[PDB]
Tab-separated table of C-alpha atoms in Angstrom:
chain	number	residue	atom	x	y	z
C	1	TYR	CA	-7.786	-3.066	-36.946
C	2	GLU	CA	-4.047	-2.430	-37.143
C	3	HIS	CA	-1.666	-4.333	-34.863
C	4	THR	CA	1.843	-2.892	-34.523
C	5	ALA	CA	4.525	-4.693	-32.505
C	6	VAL	CA	8.095	-5.980	-32.748
C	7	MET	CA	9.441	-9.455	-33.515
C	8	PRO	CA	12.802	-11.190	-33.020
C	9	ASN	CA	14.525	-12.006	-36.309
C	10	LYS	CA	14.123	-15.776	-36.101
C	11	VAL	CA	13.008	-18.371	-38.625
C	12	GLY	CA	11.557	-21.342	-36.766
C	13	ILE	CA	10.048	-19.552	-33.765
C	14	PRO	CA	6.536	-18.189	-34.414
C	15	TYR	CA	5.239	-14.896	-33.047
C	16	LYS	CA	2.046	-15.382	-31.031
C	17	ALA	CA	-0.035	-12.352	-30.075
C	18	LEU	CA	-3.574	-11.401	-29.078
C	19	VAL	CA	-5.346	-8.401	-30.609
C	20	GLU	CA	-7.250	-6.329	-28.036
C	21	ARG	CA	-10.194	-4.555	-29.674
C	22	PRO	CA	-12.674	-2.623	-27.487
C	23	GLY	CA	-16.179	-4.045	-27.668
C	24	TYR	CA	-15.004	-7.219	-29.428
C	25	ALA	CA	-13.637	-10.569	-28.318
C	26	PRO	CA	-9.852	-10.882	-28.773
C	27	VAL	CA	-8.582	-12.991	-31.652
C	28	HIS	CA	-5.386	-15.002	-32.027
C	29	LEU	CA	-2.741	-13.750	-34.462
C	30	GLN	CA	0.284	-15.870	-35.385
C	31	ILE	CA	3.215	-14.718	-37.515
C	32	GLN	CA	5.868	-17.140	-38.738
C	33	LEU	CA	8.881	-16.490	-40.952
C	34	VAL	CA	10.118	-19.002	-43.509
C	35	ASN	CA	13.101	-17.396	-45.258
C	36	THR	CA	15.101	-14.209	-44.733
C	37	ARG	CA	17.235	-13.141	-47.699
C	38	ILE	CA	19.764	-10.299	-47.794
C	39	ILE	CA	20.349	-9.494	-51.461
C	40	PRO	CA	23.174	-7.045	-52.264
C	41	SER	CA	23.641	-5.341	-55.617
C	42	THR	CA	26.688	-6.580	-57.521
C	43	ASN	CA	28.460	-5.723	-60.771
C	44	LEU	CA	30.934	-8.054	-62.452
C	45	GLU	CA	34.417	-6.640	-63.038
C	46	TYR	CA	36.295	-9.501	-64.711
C	47	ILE	CA	36.712	-13.275	-64.844
C	48	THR	CA	39.874	-15.307	-64.293
C	49	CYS	CA	41.054	-18.681	-65.565
C	50	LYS	CA	44.225	-20.576	-66.396
C	51	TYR	CA	46.103	-19.272	-69.421
C	52	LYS	CA	47.454	-21.081	-72.481
C	53	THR	CA	50.368	-19.637	-74.452
C	54	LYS	CA	50.232	-20.656	-78.100
C	55	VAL	CA	53.394	-20.454	-80.183
C	56	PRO	CA	53.130	-19.790	-83.931
C	57	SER	CA	55.576	-21.394	-86.319
C	58	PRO	CA	58.877	-19.514	-86.767
C	59	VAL	CA	60.483	-18.334	-89.998
C	60	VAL	CA	64.013	-19.606	-90.621
C	61	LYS	CA	65.885	-17.130	-92.779
C	62	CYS	CA	68.623	-19.025	-94.612
C	63	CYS	CA	70.940	-16.079	-95.371
C	64	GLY	CA	69.841	-12.844	-93.739
C	65	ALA	CA	68.026	-11.322	-90.791
C	66	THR	CA	64.551	-10.043	-89.965
C	67	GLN	CA	62.803	-7.819	-87.430
C	68	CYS	CA	59.366	-7.762	-85.816
C	69	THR	CA	56.556	-5.305	-85.179
C	70	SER	CA	54.647	-4.725	-81.948
C	71	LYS	CA	51.566	-6.747	-82.843
C	72	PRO	CA	48.477	-6.108	-80.679
C	73	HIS	CA	48.313	-9.183	-78.450
C	74	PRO	CA	48.280	-9.833	-74.687
C	75	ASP	CA	51.832	-10.411	-73.366
C	76	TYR	CA	53.247	-10.517	-76.898
C	77	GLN	CA	56.980	-11.238	-77.001
C	78	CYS	CA	59.537	-11.297	-79.805
C	79	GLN	CA	63.261	-11.852	-80.302
C	80	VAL	CA	65.708	-12.692	-83.087
C	81	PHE	CA	68.399	-15.365	-82.694
C	82	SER	CA	71.339	-15.362	-85.103
C	83	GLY	CA	73.557	-18.158	-86.386
C	84	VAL	CA	71.183	-20.978	-85.491
C	85	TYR	CA	71.886	-23.451	-88.386
C	86	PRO	CA	69.010	-25.884	-87.729
C	87	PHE	CA	68.836	-29.557	-88.669
C	88	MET	CA	65.587	-31.110	-89.851
C	89	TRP	CA	64.828	-34.673	-90.899
C	90	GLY	CA	66.729	-35.520	-94.088
C	91	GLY	CA	69.820	-33.382	-93.675
C	92	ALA	CA	70.251	-29.721	-92.868
C	93	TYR	CA	67.718	-26.977	-93.576
C	94	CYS	CA	69.811	-23.973	-94.664
C	95	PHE	CA	73.169	-23.387	-96.345
C	96	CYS	CA	74.747	-20.271	-94.796
C	97	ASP	CA	77.002	-21.552	-92.024
C	98	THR	CA	76.684	-19.525	-88.778
C	99	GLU	CA	74.589	-16.804	-90.457
C	100	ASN	CA	70.863	-17.440	-90.026
C	101	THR	CA	67.802	-16.130	-88.193
C	102	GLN	CA	64.944	-17.822	-86.327
C	103	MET	CA	61.756	-16.025	-85.339
C	104	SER	CA	60.453	-17.610	-82.080
C	105	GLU	CA	57.311	-15.521	-81.585
C	106	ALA	CA	54.990	-16.244	-78.636
C	107	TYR	CA	51.588	-15.007	-77.494
C	108	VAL	CA	49.266	-15.648	-74.524
C	109	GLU	CA	45.552	-16.484	-74.778
C	110	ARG	CA	42.939	-17.934	-72.447
C	111	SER	CA	42.286	-21.657	-72.166
C	112	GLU	CA	39.418	-23.672	-73.593
C	113	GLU	CA	38.405	-24.652	-70.050
C	114	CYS	CA	37.636	-20.991	-69.255
C	115	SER	CA	33.976	-21.575	-70.175
C	116	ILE	CA	33.639	-24.175	-67.382
C	117	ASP	CA	35.750	-23.275	-64.328
C	118	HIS	CA	36.498	-19.611	-63.708
C	119	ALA	CA	36.388	-17.167	-60.818
C	120	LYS	CA	34.087	-14.172	-61.232
C	121	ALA	CA	35.119	-10.925	-59.548
C	122	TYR	CA	32.238	-8.937	-58.050
C	123	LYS	CA	31.938	-5.607	-56.243
C	124	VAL	CA	29.216	-5.571	-53.593
C	125	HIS	CA	26.959	-2.532	-53.141
C	126	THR	CA	24.187	-2.544	-50.525
C	127	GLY	CA	20.811	-3.539	-51.937
C	128	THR	CA	17.426	-4.904	-50.876
C	129	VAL	CA	16.084	-7.280	-48.217
C	130	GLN	CA	13.046	-9.531	-48.685
C	131	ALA	CA	11.551	-12.462	-46.791
C	132	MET	CA	8.592	-14.864	-46.601
C	133	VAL	CA	5.879	-14.676	-43.924
C	134	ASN	CA	3.191	-17.168	-42.875
C	135	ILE	CA	-0.210	-15.695	-41.981
C	136	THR	CA	-3.065	-17.036	-39.874
C	137	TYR	CA	-5.703	-15.383	-37.702
C	138	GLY	CA	-8.947	-16.484	-36.059
C	139	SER	CA	-10.115	-19.513	-38.022
C	140	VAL	CA	-8.411	-18.619	-41.322
C	141	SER	CA	-5.849	-21.268	-42.240
C	142	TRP	CA	-2.112	-20.931	-42.850
C	143	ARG	CA	-1.074	-19.140	-46.034
C	144	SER	CA	2.177	-17.554	-47.175
C	145	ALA	CA	3.323	-14.842	-49.574
C	146	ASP	CA	6.550	-12.980	-50.281
C	147	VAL	CA	6.986	-9.497	-48.804
C	148	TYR	CA	9.546	-6.683	-49.060
C	149	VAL	CA	11.482	-5.668	-45.944
C	150	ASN	CA	11.568	-1.861	-46.028
C	151	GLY	CA	9.537	0.984	-44.553
C	152	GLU	CA	7.132	1.669	-47.415
C	153	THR	CA	5.774	-1.378	-49.251
C	154	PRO	CA	2.300	-2.708	-48.326
C	155	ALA	CA	1.879	-6.470	-48.794
C	156	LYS	CA	-1.627	-7.903	-49.192
C	157	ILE	CA	-1.800	-11.515	-47.987
C	158	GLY	CA	-5.204	-13.127	-47.585
C	159	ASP	CA	-7.620	-10.381	-46.595
C	160	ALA	CA	-5.155	-8.443	-44.411
C	161	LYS	CA	-2.534	-5.892	-45.439
C	162	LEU	CA	0.816	-6.400	-43.704
C	163	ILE	CA	3.745	-3.978	-43.737
C	164	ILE	CA	6.988	-5.651	-42.691
C	165	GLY	CA	9.213	-3.064	-41.048
C	166	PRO	CA	12.901	-2.530	-41.728
C	167	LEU	CA	15.650	-4.522	-40.055
C	168	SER	CA	17.109	-3.130	-36.843
C	169	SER	CA	20.684	-3.617	-38.109
C	170	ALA	CA	22.326	-3.126	-41.509
C	171	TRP	CA	24.821	-5.946	-40.912
C	172	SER	CA	25.679	-7.949	-44.031
C	173	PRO	CA	28.171	-10.841	-44.270
C	174	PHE	CA	29.613	-9.672	-47.597
C	175	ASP	CA	32.689	-7.474	-47.932
C	176	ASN	CA	33.101	-4.759	-50.597
C	177	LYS	CA	34.670	-7.196	-53.089
C	178	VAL	CA	33.698	-10.871	-53.290
C	179	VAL	CA	34.877	-13.547	-55.716
C	180	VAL	CA	32.587	-16.397	-56.800
C	181	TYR	CA	34.184	-19.712	-57.781
C	182	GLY	CA	31.733	-22.437	-58.696
C	183	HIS	CA	29.443	-23.110	-55.749
C	184	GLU	CA	30.926	-20.959	-52.964
C	185	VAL	CA	31.927	-17.324	-52.497
C	186	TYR	CA	34.990	-15.775	-50.869
C	187	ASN	CA	36.003	-12.466	-49.308
C	188	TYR	CA	39.122	-11.687	-51.340
C	189	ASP	CA	40.742	-8.519	-52.667
C	190	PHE	CA	41.365	-7.813	-56.338
C	191	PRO	CA	44.162	-6.379	-58.452
C	192	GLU	CA	41.334	-4.248	-59.994
C	193	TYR	CA	42.046	-5.003	-63.707
C	194	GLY	CA	44.990	-2.620	-63.979
C	195	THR	CA	47.425	-4.762	-62.047
C	196	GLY	CA	48.429	-8.397	-61.875
C	197	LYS	CA	51.462	-9.852	-60.151
C	198	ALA	CA	51.962	-12.671	-62.722
C	199	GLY	CA	51.613	-15.465	-60.183
C	200	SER	CA	49.006	-14.566	-57.565
C	201	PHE	CA	45.444	-13.987	-58.799
C	202	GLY	CA	45.137	-11.529	-61.672
C	203	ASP	CA	47.610	-12.720	-64.260
C	204	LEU	CA	44.738	-13.206	-66.739
C	205	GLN	CA	41.857	-10.739	-66.402
C	206	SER	CA	39.146	-10.580	-69.071
C	207	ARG	CA	36.265	-8.117	-68.763
C	208	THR	CA	33.656	-10.757	-69.619
C	209	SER	CA	33.557	-14.431	-70.565
C	210	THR	CA	33.869	-13.735	-74.318
C	211	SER	CA	35.714	-10.409	-74.440
C	212	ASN	CA	38.093	-9.706	-77.298
C	213	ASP	CA	40.187	-7.592	-74.930
C	214	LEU	CA	42.374	-9.489	-72.472
C	215	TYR	CA	44.915	-8.219	-69.945
C	216	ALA	CA	47.570	-10.784	-69.074
C	217	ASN	CA	51.059	-10.480	-67.642
C	218	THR	CA	52.818	-13.802	-67.133
C	219	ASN	CA	56.575	-12.925	-67.213
C	220	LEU	CA	56.950	-14.618	-70.590
C	221	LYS	CA	60.519	-14.739	-71.862
C	222	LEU	CA	61.857	-16.362	-75.015
C	223	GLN	CA	65.003	-18.479	-74.925
C	224	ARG	CA	67.467	-19.487	-77.603
C	225	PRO	CA	66.872	-22.725	-79.533
C	226	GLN	CA	69.835	-25.018	-79.118
C	227	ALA	CA	72.108	-27.384	-81.067
C	228	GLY	CA	70.342	-27.055	-84.413
C	229	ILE	CA	66.714	-28.034	-83.859
C	230	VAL	CA	63.561	-26.102	-84.713
C	231	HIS	CA	61.422	-25.267	-81.685
C	232	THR	CA	60.380	-22.164	-79.778
C	233	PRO	CA	61.242	-22.549	-76.073
C	234	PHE	CA	59.942	-20.037	-73.550
C	235	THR	CA	59.878	-19.485	-69.791
C	236	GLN	CA	57.091	-18.069	-67.641
C	237	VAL	CA	55.895	-18.151	-64.043
C	238	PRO	CA	53.102	-20.712	-63.404
C	239	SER	CA	49.390	-19.980	-63.189
C	240	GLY	CA	48.094	-17.702	-60.463
C	241	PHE	CA	44.570	-19.081	-60.711
C	242	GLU	CA	45.937	-22.601	-60.246
C	243	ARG	CA	47.987	-21.375	-57.273
C	244	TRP	CA	44.862	-19.721	-55.848
C	245	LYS	CA	42.962	-23.017	-55.939
C	246	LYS	CA	45.453	-24.722	-53.592
C	247	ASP	CA	46.474	-21.929	-51.189
C	248	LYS	CA	42.887	-21.006	-50.413
C	249	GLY	CA	41.025	-20.223	-47.218
C	250	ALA	CA	37.625	-21.241	-46.000
C	251	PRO	CA	34.630	-19.980	-48.008
C	252	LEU	CA	32.152	-17.441	-46.726
C	253	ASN	CA	29.458	-20.097	-46.293
C	254	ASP	CA	31.666	-21.807	-43.685
C	255	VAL	CA	32.820	-18.634	-41.897
C	256	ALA	CA	29.854	-16.231	-41.781
C	257	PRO	CA	28.334	-15.616	-38.324
C	258	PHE	CA	24.678	-15.775	-37.200
C	259	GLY	CA	24.101	-18.985	-39.184
C	260	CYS	CA	23.993	-17.245	-42.569
C	261	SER	CA	23.466	-19.791	-45.313
C	262	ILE	CA	24.790	-18.379	-48.588
C	263	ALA	CA	23.158	-19.114	-51.941
C	264	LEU	CA	24.354	-18.288	-55.413
C	265	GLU	CA	22.148	-17.363	-58.347
C	266	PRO	CA	20.932	-13.956	-57.124
C	267	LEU	CA	23.737	-14.069	-54.470
C	268	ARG	CA	21.549	-13.913	-51.389
C	269	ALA	CA	22.463	-14.596	-47.733
C	270	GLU	CA	19.673	-16.794	-46.435
C	271	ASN	CA	18.276	-17.216	-42.912
C	272	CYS	CA	20.502	-14.866	-40.924
C	273	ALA	CA	19.303	-14.162	-37.379
C	274	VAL	CA	20.154	-10.572	-36.423
C	275	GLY	CA	18.076	-7.642	-35.216
C	276	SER	CA	14.330	-7.179	-34.949
C	277	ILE	CA	11.487	-6.810	-37.453
C	278	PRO	CA	8.525	-4.520	-36.647
C	279	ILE	CA	5.107	-5.255	-38.133
C	280	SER	CA	1.833	-3.522	-38.936
C	281	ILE	CA	-1.009	-5.806	-40.066
C	282	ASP	CA	-4.517	-4.470	-40.760
C	283	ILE	CA	-6.847	-7.318	-39.786
C	284	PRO	CA	-10.333	-7.028	-41.344
C	285	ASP	CA	-13.355	-6.677	-39.085
C	286	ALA	CA	-15.069	-9.655	-40.763
C	287	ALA	CA	-13.015	-11.935	-38.477
C	288	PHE	CA	-14.151	-10.024	-35.368
C	289	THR	CA	-17.070	-11.104	-33.181
C	290	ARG	CA	-18.966	-9.147	-30.550
C	291	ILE	CA	-18.852	-9.519	-26.768
C	292	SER	CA	-22.261	-11.240	-26.788
C	293	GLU	CA	-20.954	-13.898	-29.197
C	294	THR	CA	-18.116	-15.129	-26.972
C	295	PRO	CA	-18.850	-17.016	-23.724
C	296	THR	CA	-17.476	-15.512	-20.526
C	297	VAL	CA	-15.571	-17.736	-18.106
C	298	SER	CA	-15.213	-17.597	-14.332
C	299	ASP	CA	-13.758	-19.440	-11.308
C	300	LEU	CA	-10.308	-20.059	-12.762
C	301	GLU	CA	-7.680	-22.070	-10.877
C	302	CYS	CA	-4.436	-23.128	-12.571
C	303	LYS	CA	-2.010	-25.746	-11.242
C	304	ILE	CA	1.284	-26.744	-12.872
C	305	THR	CA	1.614	-30.515	-12.540
C	306	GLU	CA	5.072	-30.882	-14.093
C	307	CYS	CA	7.702	-28.455	-15.385
C	308	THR	CA	11.108	-28.950	-16.988
C	309	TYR	CA	13.932	-26.521	-17.764
C	310	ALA	CA	14.579	-27.752	-21.334
C	311	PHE	CA	13.487	-25.860	-24.436
C	312	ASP	CA	11.239	-28.576	-25.639
C	313	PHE	CA	7.636	-28.069	-24.530
C	314	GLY	CA	8.282	-29.608	-21.133
C	315	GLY	CA	5.696	-27.956	-18.926
C	316	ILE	CA	2.178	-29.332	-18.420
C	317	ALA	CA	-0.515	-27.522	-16.429
C	318	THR	CA	-4.187	-28.293	-15.803
C	319	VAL	CA	-6.686	-25.481	-15.220
C	320	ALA	CA	-10.363	-25.878	-14.299
C	321	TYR	CA	-12.887	-23.286	-15.475
C	322	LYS	CA	-16.602	-22.558	-15.185
C	323	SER	CA	-17.951	-21.137	-18.441
C	324	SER	CA	-21.412	-19.825	-19.251
C	325	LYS	CA	-21.790	-22.005	-22.359
C	326	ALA	CA	-19.775	-24.085	-24.803
C	327	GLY	CA	-17.511	-22.352	-27.282
C	328	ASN	CA	-13.983	-21.842	-28.572
C	329	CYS	CA	-11.878	-18.902	-27.449
C	330	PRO	CA	-8.100	-18.546	-27.815
C	331	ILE	CA	-5.623	-18.643	-24.947
C	332	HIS	CA	-2.413	-16.624	-24.770
C	333	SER	CA	0.325	-15.744	-22.295
C	334	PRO	CA	1.363	-12.077	-22.701
C	335	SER	CA	4.489	-12.329	-20.561
C	336	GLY	CA	7.810	-13.606	-21.853
C	337	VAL	CA	8.244	-16.231	-19.135
C	338	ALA	CA	6.299	-18.906	-21.024
C	339	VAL	CA	5.217	-19.639	-24.581
C	340	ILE	CA	2.074	-21.668	-25.285
C	341	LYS	CA	1.902	-24.541	-27.759
C	342	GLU	CA	-1.828	-24.487	-28.583
C	343	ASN	CA	-3.922	-21.439	-29.457
C	344	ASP	CA	-7.595	-22.382	-29.074
C	345	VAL	CA	-9.362	-24.806	-26.726
C	346	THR	CA	-12.569	-26.855	-26.553
C	347	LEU	CA	-14.705	-25.309	-23.818
C	348	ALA	CA	-17.659	-26.879	-22.025
C	349	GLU	CA	-19.815	-26.255	-18.946
C	350	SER	CA	-17.258	-26.190	-16.080
C	351	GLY	CA	-14.610	-28.503	-17.496
C	352	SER	CA	-10.828	-28.640	-17.277
C	353	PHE	CA	-8.193	-28.433	-20.009
C	354	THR	CA	-4.450	-29.033	-20.223
C	355	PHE	CA	-1.951	-26.829	-22.049
C	356	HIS	CA	1.745	-27.341	-22.777
C	357	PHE	CA	4.294	-24.588	-22.191
C	358	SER	CA	8.070	-24.135	-22.321
C	359	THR	CA	9.852	-21.754	-19.935
C	360	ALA	CA	13.453	-21.072	-18.951
C	361	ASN	CA	12.802	-20.280	-15.274
C	362	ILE	CA	13.288	-22.333	-12.134
C	363	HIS	CA	10.042	-20.884	-10.732
C	364	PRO	CA	7.658	-19.611	-13.435
C	365	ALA	CA	5.408	-16.688	-12.543
C	366	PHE	CA	3.557	-16.118	-15.813
C	367	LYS	CA	-0.168	-15.616	-16.324
C	368	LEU	CA	-2.446	-16.467	-19.231
C	369	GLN	CA	-5.812	-15.190	-20.422
C	370	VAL	CA	-8.764	-17.276	-21.607
C	371	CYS	CA	-11.814	-15.493	-23.123
C	372	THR	CA	-10.449	-12.072	-21.973
C	373	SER	CA	-10.161	-13.369	-18.398
C	374	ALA	CA	-6.794	-13.758	-16.691
C	375	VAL	CA	-5.480	-16.433	-14.324
C	376	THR	CA	-2.071	-16.673	-12.636
C	377	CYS	CA	0.028	-19.851	-12.713
C	378	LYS	CA	3.119	-20.737	-10.694
C	379	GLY	CA	5.228	-23.765	-9.896
C	380	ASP	CA	8.699	-25.277	-9.720
C	381	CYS	CA	10.894	-26.772	-12.436
C	382	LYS	CA	13.642	-29.400	-12.645
C	383	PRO	CA	16.799	-29.388	-14.817
C	384	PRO	CA	16.830	-31.630	-17.900
C	385	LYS	CA	18.889	-34.789	-18.166
C	386	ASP	CA	20.108	-34.086	-21.708
C	387	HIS	CA	23.324	-32.219	-22.489
C	388	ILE	CA	23.096	-31.473	-26.230
C	389	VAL	CA	20.043	-31.473	-28.519
C	390	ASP	CA	19.395	-30.916	-32.222
C	391	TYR	CA	16.687	-28.225	-32.073
C	392	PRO	CA	16.922	-24.533	-31.110
C	393	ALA	CA	15.401	-22.869	-28.068
C	394	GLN	CA	11.663	-22.212	-28.083
C	395	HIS	CA	11.821	-19.848	-25.099
C	396	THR	CA	13.960	-16.786	-24.364
C	397	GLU	CA	16.531	-16.390	-21.594
C	398	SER	CA	16.353	-13.389	-19.266
C	399	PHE	CA	18.663	-12.045	-16.568
C	400	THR	CA	16.582	-13.134	-13.556
C	401	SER	CA	15.368	-16.421	-15.058
C	402	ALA	CA	18.130	-18.442	-13.366
C	403	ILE	CA	17.595	-17.296	-9.763
C	404	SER	CA	16.042	-19.899	-7.477
C	405	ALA	CA	14.011	-19.051	-4.388
C	406	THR	CA	16.787	-20.087	-1.986
C	407	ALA	CA	19.372	-17.855	-3.668
C	408	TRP	CA	16.813	-15.051	-3.952
C	409	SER	CA	16.299	-15.209	-0.184
C	410	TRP	CA	20.064	-15.382	0.392
C	411	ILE	CA	20.603	-12.062	-1.404
C	412	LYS	CA	17.559	-10.631	0.395
C	413	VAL	CA	19.428	-10.675	3.728
C	414	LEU	CA	22.853	-9.678	2.366
C	415	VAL	CA	21.446	-6.396	1.006
C	416	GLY	CA	18.260	-6.279	3.056
C	417	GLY	CA	19.498	-6.637	6.623
C	418	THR	CA	22.908	-5.053	5.960
C	419	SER	CA	21.497	-1.869	4.409
C	420	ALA	CA	18.994	-1.746	7.278
C	421	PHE	CA	21.872	-2.159	9.748
C	422	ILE	CA	23.293	1.234	8.730
C	423	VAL	CA	19.829	2.661	9.460
C	424	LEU	CA	20.360	1.626	13.092
C	425	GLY	CA	23.841	3.157	13.095
C	426	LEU	CA	22.647	6.421	11.552
C	427	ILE	CA	19.801	7.018	14.012
C	428	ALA	CA	22.136	6.493	16.982
C	429	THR	CA	24.060	9.515	15.705
C	430	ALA	CA	20.777	11.392	15.183
C	431	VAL	CA	19.715	10.824	18.808
C	432	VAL	CA	23.123	11.538	20.362
C	433	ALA	CA	22.839	15.018	18.849
C	434	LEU	CA	19.403	15.419	20.441
C	435	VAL	CA	20.416	14.058	23.855
C	436	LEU	CA	23.448	16.379	23.982
C	437	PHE	CA	21.442	19.416	22.862
C	438	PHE	CA	18.987	18.822	25.718
C	439	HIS	CA	21.840	18.909	28.252
C	440	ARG	CA	22.269	22.647	27.623
C	441	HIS	CA	18.609	23.532	28.242
G	1	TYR	CA	16.497	-44.210	-20.464
G	2	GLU	CA	19.125	-45.184	-17.882
G	3	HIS	CA	18.376	-45.830	-14.202
G	4	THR	CA	21.149	-46.371	-11.641
G	5	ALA	CA	20.742	-47.551	-8.046
G	6	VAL	CA	22.200	-49.937	-5.451
G	7	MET	CA	20.634	-53.323	-4.742
G	8	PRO	CA	21.558	-55.570	-1.780
G	9	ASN	CA	23.193	-58.974	-2.128
G	10	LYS	CA	20.223	-61.154	-1.202
G	11	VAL	CA	18.918	-63.904	-3.457
G	12	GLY	CA	15.207	-64.375	-2.922
G	13	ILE	CA	14.352	-60.754	-2.072
G	14	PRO	CA	13.265	-58.684	-5.105
G	15	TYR	CA	14.312	-55.074	-5.605
G	16	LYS	CA	11.494	-52.742	-6.646
G	17	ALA	CA	11.969	-49.296	-8.164
G	18	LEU	CA	9.926	-46.686	-10.028
G	19	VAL	CA	11.747	-45.017	-12.912
G	20	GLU	CA	10.714	-41.407	-13.557
G	21	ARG	CA	11.261	-40.168	-17.084
G	22	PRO	CA	10.186	-36.502	-17.339
G	23	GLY	CA	7.132	-35.980	-19.507
G	24	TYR	CA	6.215	-39.679	-19.329
G	25	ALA	CA	4.369	-42.019	-17.006
G	26	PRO	CA	6.387	-43.905	-14.365
G	27	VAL	CA	7.262	-47.534	-15.076
G	28	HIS	CA	7.598	-50.196	-12.392
G	29	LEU	CA	10.884	-52.114	-12.292
G	30	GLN	CA	11.717	-55.408	-10.578
G	31	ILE	CA	15.190	-56.988	-10.431
G	32	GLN	CA	15.656	-60.347	-8.724
G	33	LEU	CA	18.697	-62.586	-8.359
G	34	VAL	CA	18.614	-66.367	-8.767
G	35	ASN	CA	22.268	-67.406	-8.370
G	36	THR	CA	25.447	-65.739	-7.140
G	37	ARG	CA	28.610	-67.725	-7.870
G	38	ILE	CA	32.173	-66.774	-6.919
G	39	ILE	CA	34.566	-68.739	-9.132
G	40	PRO	CA	38.228	-68.618	-8.071
G	41	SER	CA	40.995	-69.538	-10.488
G	42	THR	CA	42.715	-72.781	-9.496
G	43	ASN	CA	45.757	-74.721	-10.677
G	44	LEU	CA	46.410	-78.340	-9.743
G	45	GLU	CA	49.692	-79.157	-8.012
G	46	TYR	CA	49.511	-82.837	-7.090
G	47	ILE	CA	47.082	-85.616	-6.296
G	48	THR	CA	47.421	-88.134	-3.488
G	49	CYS	CA	46.020	-91.602	-2.874
């Protein structure tokens, strides 16, 4: 038997339902989620790290001049300085006074720390969604298996085939372009490998972690060596990756709404709570019993001894039955006013059992069924003493769940008697037309 | 759990109350005084004999 219904996209809260099959006793079906992963499809554009400009040794022409060729190198710079006349250890180096040439060639490469700390630039394209569901029905125990959240894939868990329906919203926390640095991800824009502003983020872009190609602008500029010493001095703007690591916002795993935990190695977005998930589970008939197998119950009276407003299970009710024989049949509340903590019960010959519930109403008006026989429960509830707790809400909050009986009666005379007061005023007009018409004849 | 009330200022008469924690059984409570001493602050000025 198939069972198709809808489910809120929650992790901790189970989904309790009863399957109504004609000619068979109803069975208890419980669905619980464990994880909920949103996995986009990403492609790496480039990586970024701090640079390191190595300077080769210069040639010191003693009497003459040289030139240089445009060597293929990232941010390669060249100049020629004349009349240097350098001094080394042990006297001067050249002989021609005020007629010399120093090379001073510089070149930019990536650092040796680039294999450890780097930022990877990704482009996010919408991908797949998968989750993990816990399955139990009847007397079969809890078991779990991974499913795929789409509209097509059948997942066989246990003996039943479950199709998890698609999400009701395509909301994803990721932007078009994300950057991954170490443990956390960010929503940051890129210079897109063609640009780089020499001090901001893309002053060293390499297409992969070991690429021979390397784009790097760093505003490198060679300066003149001074006073007769041999060195190559340069001048460049500082690192844009180093500047990014200080002037940096909050990561996406501290900013993302709906409680989206963000993991790394397939770049998922775990345990978001948005939308609804439809289901379709084909329960086998081997877990179904006939009407003659189950014991019928009668003479049901339910009394709520104590109720509390909090979203712990703070409502206790005792109900006395009169069954035909001993047995075990599940209980369930179909309405959304109350959820029920236990599923089955130990029946006897005209006993009484207690069940724990958790509502969000001042006056609950739910009903529950035991061995396909209904009984209505009602009572009053008190507010809880606590202000802040560490566990989420087991129930659900409706529009009319906060209205007490005194305030419900107060609005029943401000729209009940007042709207009926215009009925008195309208019929006085309707009879003054009749009493004036009768004056003529 | 915290329970607040008002007891009278009598010595031998015990105060009885029933605390009501929700979800739990009530617990009897009994507070009784033994002494009640008012101690003013004094400073000696002189003695006489």
